[PDB]
Amino acid sequence: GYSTDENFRYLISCFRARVKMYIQVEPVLDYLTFLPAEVKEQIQRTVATSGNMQAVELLLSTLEKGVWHLGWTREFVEALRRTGSPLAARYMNPELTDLPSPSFENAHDEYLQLLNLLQPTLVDKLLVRDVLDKCMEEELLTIEDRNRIAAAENNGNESGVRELLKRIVQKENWFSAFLNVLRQTGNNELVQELTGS
Amino acid sequence: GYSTDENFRYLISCFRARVKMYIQVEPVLDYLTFLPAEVKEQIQRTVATSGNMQAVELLLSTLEKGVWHLGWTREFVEALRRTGSPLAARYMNPELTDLPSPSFENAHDEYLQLLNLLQPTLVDKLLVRDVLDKCMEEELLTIEDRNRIAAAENNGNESGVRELLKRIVQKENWFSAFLNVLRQTGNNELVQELTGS
Amino acid sequence: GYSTDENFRYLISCFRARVKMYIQVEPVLDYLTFLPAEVKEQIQRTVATSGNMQAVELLLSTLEKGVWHLGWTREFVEALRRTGSPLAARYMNPELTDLPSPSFENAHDEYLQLLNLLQPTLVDKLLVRDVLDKCMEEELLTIEDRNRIAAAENNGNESGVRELLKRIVQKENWFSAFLNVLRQTGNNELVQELTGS
Amino acid sequence: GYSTDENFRYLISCFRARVKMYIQVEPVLDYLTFLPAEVKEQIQRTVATSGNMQAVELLLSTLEKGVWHLGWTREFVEALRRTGSPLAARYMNPELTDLPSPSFENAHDEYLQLLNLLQPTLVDKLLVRDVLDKCMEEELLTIEDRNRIAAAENNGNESGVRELLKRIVQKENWFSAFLNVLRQTGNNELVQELTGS
Amino acid sequence: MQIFVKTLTGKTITLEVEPSDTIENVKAKIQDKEGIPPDQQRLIFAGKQLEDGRTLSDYNIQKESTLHLVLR
Amino acid sequence: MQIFVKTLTGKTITLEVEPSDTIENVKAKIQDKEGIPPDQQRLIFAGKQLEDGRTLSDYNIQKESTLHLVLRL
Amino acid sequence: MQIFVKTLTGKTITLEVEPSDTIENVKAKIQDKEGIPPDQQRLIFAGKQLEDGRTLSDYNIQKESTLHLVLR
Amino acid sequence: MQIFVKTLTGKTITLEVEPSDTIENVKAKIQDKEGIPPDQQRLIFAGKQLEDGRTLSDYNIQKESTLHLVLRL
Amino acid sequence: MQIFVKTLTGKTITLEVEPSDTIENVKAKIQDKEGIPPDQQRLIFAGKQLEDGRTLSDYNIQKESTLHLVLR
Amino acid sequence: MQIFVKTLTGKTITLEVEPSDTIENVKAKIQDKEGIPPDQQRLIFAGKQLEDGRTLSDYNIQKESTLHLVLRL
Amino acid sequence: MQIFVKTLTGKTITLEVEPSDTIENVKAKIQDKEGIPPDQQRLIFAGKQLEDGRTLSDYNIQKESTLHLVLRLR
Amino acid sequence: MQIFVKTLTGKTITLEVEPSDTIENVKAKIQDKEGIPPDQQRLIFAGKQLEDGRTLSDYNIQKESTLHLVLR
């Protein structure tokens, strides 16, 4: 099969788990104009009720089944590239040019597991109000994602940091970028803790 | 020349595609006193899990099938009239007098599609903290709707704009008023990017 | 002078419609140990899929059909009693010495059916921010319900009220107690609306 | 054994009720590539309609019949292995030395019935807002689970706990890890309750 | 006008009555055909206690509708 | 103008009114049609206890609308 | 090219039209076989009012598309 | 009075007590008929621990009510 | 009390046993009936493995119950 | 570089262009085939207005893409 | 071992490989059995991209496991 | 005493370790059992490193307590 629509369908099957963890589905719903106004509403409710990942699945499932205007697979991908989930944009491209090197994917895949084990220290010793502004210019947070972190920061610092960490790990080259924040931030102790050195 | 229930079942069969967009089903349920509480519970779920638009389809469908007590139609229409969804009330009104002119329906379909397209532009450039009060003052948002939007933008300005754009697109003559709101407030840039002049 | 199981299977057949208004099925499932966790989850889904009242209808049904370990009937009653829905216990206890007098039942079906009529008036004028605190004091809301209401108001006040007015109607002697909440709280005008004197 | 299929088709026959508790079918459907996309929808709805466990029943049923691609079993197991629920990966493995010692299986069925008996105590006292963070430090919640814990916490804390306890009982050696979470947070009452020290 | 009165034993009870009678009368007709004293009788329709003062039509008792009886 | 009055128990009352009628007139028809005294009527329409001195056209009760009747203390 | 102008009375009416034809043409076809003068009927398709000017091609009226007809 | 005690394995054993017995009685008579240490016993009823000090009636157990017997860990 | 042990091969092993019987005796008669060493043997009942010490009563295994035998 | 432009009525048009082309040419290309003057033309791609002074390369259009066409006075 | 790779078209390629073989080795086996050059192949093992330098044992690829093959097409 | 280890591969390995064993003991025995070299690792417990020269007694490593080890 040499059709792009059918190729994109098969490429999801290979990567379906990775993309679900890499897609922020609330923003990407704006640029998906071809999606019916109904399905675009159901997906935003699936975010609220059954978690983001079961929303991205609904987003994906309704993308493949059902025809769309030719050239949508680039509209979808370009949406993901500019709604603060560029790493899923790497995987999603049918021509497969911009797929992160397997050294990168594996190395970050264990970097992500590393943060999960370090959240209790992070949520304690890291404070969002003094890292968000720096995090913006490193270009691993969008205006869309900055507001939520500032919004979640309302009910305590801890809930803010849990939101920041949930958000950076989808950005491209995020671990190296995240460290560049921490060392350029007053949390020079954490970067010792993250990599051990 | 038929009984009001018969052609009302017809009107919710013809205009079902329209009023599925114009009915805000969450507050219209407080007035449907003929609905058994076991149905209003189910619809208040489909609102919560499957999005507002799929709930209206359920609400209308459960209104077609099943006989309700004589005099229900005037209650349903008066429900739409004062829950702040007047445009749906024009279609449902079996007297069939305030039904909007087709050019109005044609245009405001075009403006809606234009609003879906430009939504990523709007969401990134529109602050609901500065536009709700005028929308209340311009009678295209209800106290119901302002509370919903003002509480759905606690998790970020952008997420509130999503809710604001879903509400106003149900109001009567919403576009001209909406532009008037943007023009009346300081948000003059959008209308230049929204009406193309 | 009869078996205790068949006495209870009779009550959930007699008062099935009566009690399904009073049972909050979501928390009562914690106390039901005879139910296989496979079924306890199906009911938890019917809550999320088709609302509480259509979930109790399933819960009571799956008790009427299906043989459980002996001694379940007392467990269900003590489930209802201490899950905060004691009005449902009276209709279930095969010691029928505790069910309310028929005048009381009618006096509370009208006070409920009147509350439904005046629901739009309440939802507009009620503020759950300053009614939850004293409803807990008047012991017609459980800590489970206050969390639910305070979490169902996060998307607007009016969504909080509609959740409050479903929790109240299940409690015991609620109407007088509810008015006592309204009288002490600043919502004095609602009383004149709600009692008409 | 002789053949990988009949080994596996028979391992789901023996251990069907033992994995039904352990398999979280929502994320594991991602990696089951061999399943026709139309079969996957038939299950993704049974999760929505009749809970997870009655869906795993449907999933394992639809595997025990119907020819599948070569290497499906090892594709199934690798799904369970990397979906974060390795406990069922011991039983489903056509290799036998993985499956746990009968005391270990017994010791956990006790640790499971202990929750189902003390769940009302847990639900009322546990706060998933603060206990969640240390639960992912012990790696007893996956990436997918915490989304559903954090999302189900939208409507009340008690819904968060009722969903947390539904997840952690699927992880290998969870009781000792769960107590470590409870002891190393404020919940020193529950550990007193769970173990009666 | 007719009604079915279900009891615990499952032996459904059938009554040929007229909507004008008070609940006492159906509580008194059970005397004439089963003999359970009326005081012990607690007669339920659709999960709603039937006040002895009111009459059957007041509870929207329609033709050959089902009725539940609870004793002791 | 045709109006339906439904009481709490569930029965309906068939009314004959006209939009210029005051509520007392409607209650007056409630008197001679089924027999509840004027002080014992509370009229709820669209979740609003109707004020007595007003008239139907004030609340915009259209043809074959329904009024809910609740007895008072 | 076939369309079905469903009505209140329920009897579906089948009209041989052409996507080149404008709305008034099928409204003129109402004169042929219905007898409702074109002004007071208001044709509707998929929740979309059909204008006086445009053509059925403009509204995507393909093979076997149904219309609705609201009177007065 | 006539109480069922469900052990974790499910082998429920019927008991007969006095509806206001001290919990030591019901705990003791379990091992009289079942044989698990009079201290290993940890009775759970309605999601609650049963401390030995209180009586059966204060925990509001009726007839045919079931207690859950889980072993001390 | 007869119980049904079903093997990977598919042939079902029916065992005349008693609730008083321990697990090993159940394993013991399998040696007689098929020549399968008890070390290889491990019985499964409803996804629950069978500790050797206990008896059939401990696991609520009643008349016409189904047991599973898995080798290796 | 095949591209498409979508009008709101559901019709679609096909174009052949090059990435450095100005939108002015693209709008003018639409006019030649459908008659709508470039003044009335308004092109939307990726949810934004497409400036006339810039080119497709500036807006990262590829082949087989679909633009949206909206009109105004 | 004996592992499977699924291509886009659907047909699965069965390989006589053993855990001692690195990913460069198996990618050659695909080429010898199917014909895609090694520089064009990107092998996927259940949502995990396989590094060229490592061996199957590093990825816990048990016998009769599966791989997904995606080709950087034009 | 026994403890569990989970490499960033996620895999669960049972280890026999005494609190009389310091980190220098466990650093090699995981290498002996698995093959992650003792100097290219680091131990994650309670979200923290582990000092090589310190004993697990210092760190409150109860029986069955689960570790995690990383690749630096």
PDB file of C-alpha atoms in Angstrom, chain J residues 20 23 26 39-40 42 47 56:
ATOM      1  CA  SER J  20       8.141  30.665  -2.813  1.00  0.00           C
ATOM      2  CA  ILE J  23      -0.317  34.458  -1.863  1.00  0.00           C
ATOM      3  CA  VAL J  26      -2.496  32.086  -5.427  1.00  0.00           C
ATOM      4  CA  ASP J  39     -10.030  41.759  -2.892  1.00  0.00           C
ATOM      5  CA  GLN J  40     -12.875  39.532  -1.719  1.00  0.00           C
ATOM      6  CA  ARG J  42      -9.492  35.542   2.110  1.00  0.00           C
ATOM      7  CA  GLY J  47      -6.177  28.620  11.611  1.00  0.00           C
ATOM      8  CA  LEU J  56       3.716  29.791   0.953  1.00  0.00           C
TER       9      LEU J  56
END
